UniProtKB/Swiss-Prot annotation, chains A, B:
Attaches the virion to the cell membrane by interacting with host receptor, initiating the infection. Binding to human ACE2 and CLEC4M/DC-SIGNR receptors and internalization of the virus into the endosomes of the host cell induces conformational changes in the S glycoprotein. Proteolysis by cathepsin CTSL may unmask the fusion peptide of S2 and activate membrane fusion within endosomes. The gene is S. The chain holds residues 356 to 405 of 1255 of the full protein. Glycans are attached at residue 2. This is Spike protein S1.
Length: 50, 50
């Protein structure tokens, strides 16, 4: 909360206000770099080049 | 996919992933120019000058 600030943060299947009260089973992190217009394509139902 | 890139692309009444599987009846294209803050008003159920 003092260092890193996110322009997009969106959660699917779970309320964002309850992430502090849960425990998670199989956690994986995928990393990549896109341009600014292509961030809207990282979503469950989407079309486009990405 | 090599030339034109869209800042917004949103579809209503259909999932975007199925546009390659369908065939469309009465296609019309409406063209105009707005400013950056007025793009959010091209949606059903909006208020604003546009
Ligand atoms: C020029 C008129 C085309 C009429 C097509 C009619 C129905 C098909 C609907 C949508 C597909 C074409 C729209 C462009 C979508 C760009 C997708 C992308 O690149 O991210
Ligand atoms: C200080 C006045 C308080 C008014 C609140 C009273 C009722 C609320 C109903 C509508 C408020 C709309 C606020 C302006 C919206 C601008 C719409 C636009 O142009 O895109
Ligand atoms: C948060 O960042 C500032 C930046 O210098 C730092 O001084 C502060 O100690 C940090 N907070 C904590 C709890 O470490
Ligand atoms: C896409 O655009 C580039 C731009 O130089 C071009 O070289 C390439 O041939 C285009 N793709 C196709 C399939 O024509």
């Amino acid at each position: 909360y003092n260092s890193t600030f996110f322009s997009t943060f969106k959660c699917y299947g779970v309320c964002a206000t309850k992430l502090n009260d849960l425990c998670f089973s199989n956690v994986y992190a995928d990393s990549f770099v896109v341009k600014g217009d292509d961030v809207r394509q990282i979503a469950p139902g989407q079309t486009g080049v990405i």
